[PDB]
Every structure is written in C-alpha cells, then in structure tokens.
C-alpha cells in the first residue's frame, strides 16, 4: 500500500492550497478516505472524510466553510482544498485510508506552513572528519528538509537530527553518519538534501579535512 502526498509548503495567511494524495496497492474506489492533521506542538485532529462514491462529505468543526475534500476514482487520487488559512492551520496533513470506521494506512504527510515570511533554500556545509562525517543544512524556511546519504544507499550510522529554530526566523539542522575510519580514502560520501518548499535540491560531497 502506498499513499503519496503532495502539495503544501508555504502560504500567506488568508491564502489557499490544494493537497493531493495518490493511492496504490489497494482498490481505491471501495474505501472511504480521510484527511487528518497535526500541528507541531499537539495531537491528531481528524479534518475531513469522503465516502466511497464521493456523494457524502464530512468536516471537522474548525475547518467548515474553508476546506473542500474531493476524490477521483479513475485516477486513484484524493484531494483537500484548504482556504482562508490562518497561522494555526500550520500542520502536517496526512491522508488516511479507511478500513471500517478506523484508519489502517496513513501517508507520511505534507507540512503546510502559514506565514507572512518568504521561502528560503538551505546552504549546505560539510562537517568533515570510527569517524563521523556530516552535513550542516543551514538557514532555510520553512520546514521541511529531508536528508539521504548516497541516494539512500547508505543506511547504517545515519542520524538526522531535528531542526533548530534560530532567533533569525530560519531553521538549521544536521545529519551525521558514523563510518569506519579505514574508508576515508576509498569510499565517497554524498549528502542529498531535499527542500521541496523551495524546489531546491542540493547534493554535497563530504571529504576529509585538509
């Protein structure tokens, strides 16, 4: 089962976004679908539901008059139009498949950030080197940034830390890998940093210090 989300990013207060989710690995047109959200601080809030046929449509109290859910059963997609957005609509939005009055499969979610600020891509610096090498992903906005190492081939010893909000208003995080010292000359270490809200993607090669 896959539920792949899209849409999201930054939007000015009062503005609007469409979110979509594409579904595979199950018979999409036989299930009700939902969207659920989660603000950075707090919990899950169910947002919306659409019946199998698209004929019935339900909304949480704090969302009515502003959100519209729709689905397309020939293209296996689900959509949430979110309007008149306020800073408190800042959240991760998950699409969720219904089993039967429960939700058995969730998407990984897209982060909607509602602010009057503007978009800014990351500057990616190497933390050069058992040794540890890493990448310092600095001064971006808004969240989120994803980090992989060597196109996701490298898995062990990887820890990407949470982001830090600076008094500037920008985020910064780092990703670190722990590698056998014996390979600093033979293996190549590349950090791949995706910042979808700015359509920027940056690959940095990390090499041992001079």
């Amino acid at each position: 089962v896959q539920l792949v989300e899209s849409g999201g990013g930054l939007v000015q207060p009062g503005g609007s976004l469409r979110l979509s989710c594409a579904a595979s690995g199950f018979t999409f047109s036989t299930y009700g679908m939902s969207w659920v959200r989660q603000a950075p601080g707090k919990g899950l809030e169910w947002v919306s539901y659409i019946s199998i046929s698209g004929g019935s449509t339900y909304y949480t109290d704090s969302v009515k008059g502003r959100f519209t859910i729709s689905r397309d059963n020939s293209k296996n997609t689900l959509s949430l139009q979110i309007n008149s957005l306020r800073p408190e609509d800042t959240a991760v939005y998950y699409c969720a498949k219904e089993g039967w009055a429960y939700f058995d499969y969730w998407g990984q979610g897209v982060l909607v950030t509602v602010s009057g600020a503007s978009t800014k891509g990351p500057s990616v610096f190497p933390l050069a080197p058992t040794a540890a090498l890493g990448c310092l992903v600095k001064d971006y906005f808004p969240e989120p940034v994803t980090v992989s190492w060597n196109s996701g081939a490298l898995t062990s010893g990887v820890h990407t830390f949470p982001a830090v909000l600076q008094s500037s208003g920008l985020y910064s995080l780092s990703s670190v890998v722990t590698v056998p010292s014996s390979s600093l000359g033979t293996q190549t270490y590349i950090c791949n940093v995706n910042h979808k809200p700015s359509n920027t993607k940056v690959d940095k090669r990390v090499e041992p210090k001079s």
């Binding site: 019935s56 039967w100 933390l127 949470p162 830090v164 600076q166 910064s172 670190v176």
Partner: protein, 210 residues
C-alpha cells in the same frame, strides 16, 4: 467539538503492565464499536494499533489489548518493552459522520539500561567561513535516559547557543545537537571553545581550537 480525553503522560517501567484511559460521550465511545487506537513514534506517521474497540491487526504485538465500558475506552499494554515508548491516540466515530481523536498520551518506559552520551564536536567548515560566518556543532548521541544539559565555553569562560530537545534514535537511546553561532573573527580570537554535556552525574566535555 471537544476531543476524547486521555492522560497526557504515563511513566512506567520495563516489564510492567499499563492501562491508558480515553473518555468520551454517548455519541462516540458509548453508542458505537467505532473505537480505534494509534501509536506514533517521533518523525513518523501514526500507525493503527487497535480497531473495533478490541481487535488487533496482524503484525501488532499481542501485548496490546483494547476494551470499553460506558463512555470510557481502555488501551492495555502488557510487559512494557522499550519500543512501546510512543504517543498513543484514542479515536472514535461520532454520530453525524465525523471522527474525533483523543488528546494524546505520551508513554515513557523508565527502567532501561543507562547509556552515557558520546559527544562529537565540529569546528566551522571552511566554506562557511568563506561565507563570512562561523558555526560550531556539538552532536550528542547514545545516551539513556533522555535528560541532558548543554553548556558552551570559550577557552574556559562560559558562553549564541541553540539546542535541540533530545529525540528518538531510538533503538534504546537519545540524541541532541547544540549549535554555537559565531562571527568568524570571534572564532579567530579565543584559543579554544568547548562543548559540555551534563547527563546524570557525569559530564562529558569536548574542545576544538582554530
């Protein structure tokens, strides 16, 4: 439009049994068997734990059991293991066709083997310096329990510091990062800078120099 109510925190020990309450009204938990429970680890989407009040999906450990009585639902976890450390959410169908989540419960699993923090400290990258900026990065990992205090020194005087709240690695332990932001000349001035990490009754300290 009010949520199902749960305890915000529960601290228990390895091997113990815990029970988490979720209270609603007659329109949700009372009149329907539409009660489901979800687990959420950090940086990941919720997963379904229990549906139809007491049914376990395959794959879910049988240490997890659900029930209800009147307007109160119960999630019970037998033989707490370290992996059970997660957020738990109650959820229910509600008359009118909506779903409503519980406010959430954070579960801490106490009696785990204590691990001391490994500290790794990075001077500013050369490329960052070329961009007229300095930033020291202190990465802390592999420590249990999760409480740490991070201090910074310049030579030996105490010190632009931002620190992440510790976080799930989370096999057994935690990780955090602290950043010291400097102007490159302030970096060029002092003989050394230190990162001090205080955990339990130990403090691990590291030092870099220009």
């Amino acid at each position: 439009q009010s949520a199902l109510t749960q305890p915000p925190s529960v601290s228990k020990s390895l091997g113990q049994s815990v029970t988490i309450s979720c209270t609603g009204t007659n329109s949700d938990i009372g009149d329907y068997n539409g009660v489901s429970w979800y687990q959420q680890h950090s940086g990941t989407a919720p997963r379904l734990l229990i549906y139809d009040v007491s049914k376990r999906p395959s794959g879910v450990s049988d240490r997890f059991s659900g029930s209800k009585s009147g307007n109160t639902a119960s999630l019970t976890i037998s033989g707490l293991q370290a992996e059970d450390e997660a957020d738990y959410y109650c959820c229910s169908y509600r008359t009118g066709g909506t779903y409503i989540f519980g406010t959430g419960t954070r579960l801490t699993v106490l009696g785990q083997p204590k691990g001391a923090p490994s500290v790794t400290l990075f001077p500013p990258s050369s490329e960052e310096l070329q961009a007229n900026k300095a930033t020291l990065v202190c990465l802390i990992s592999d420590f249990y329990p999760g409480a740490v205090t991070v201090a910074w020194k310049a030579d030996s005087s105490p010190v632009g510091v931002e620190t992440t709240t510790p976080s799930k690695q989370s096999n057994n332990k935690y990780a955090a990062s602290s950043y010291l932001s400097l102007t490159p000349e302030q970096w060029k001035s002092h003989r050394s800078y230190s990162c001090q990490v205080t955990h339990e009754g130990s403090t691990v300290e590291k030092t870099v120099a220009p």
